């Protein structure tokens, strides 16, 4: 390096820093990925149960 025009310097390298990023959820494998073909998805649901039986 050169300080001004007639003087020299000592160069000590560079310092770098990056921000944090969290990855807790990705480590839990909690989601399942599907690859479709269009921008519409359909889901179907079914319910069932039981009932009473009165005396006869």
């Amino acid at each position: 390096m050169q300080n001004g025009d007639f003087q020299i310097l000592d160069y000590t390298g560079l310092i770098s820093t990056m921000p944090r990023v969290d990855t807790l959820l990705q480590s839990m494998n909690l989601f399942t990925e599907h690859f479709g073909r269009t921008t519409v998805a359909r889901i179907e649901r079914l319910d069932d149960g039981a009932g009473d039986i009165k005396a006869v």
């Binding site: 069932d48 149960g49 039981a50 009932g51 009473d52 039986i53 009165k54 005396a55 006869v56």
Partner: protein, 55 residues
């Protein structure tokens, strides 16, 4: 599907009937003919050990 529904409905009734016995009464929801009250039938009474948690 219908067969499974029928099985589950009978199973539920059995549990309800078993539970109704502890309170001292027979289980016959829709029939007065067999609606027995065991404390009355055998001539006994119910004792209550009431507990107070507020003190």
């Amino acid at each position: 599907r219908h067969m499974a529904r029928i099985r589950r409905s009978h199973a539920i009734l059995k549990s309800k009937a078993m539970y109704a016995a502890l309170k001292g009464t027979s289980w016959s929801p829709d029939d007065p003919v067999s609606d027995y009250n065991y404390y009355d039938v055998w001539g006994a009474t119910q004792t209550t050990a009431d507990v107070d948690f507020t003190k």
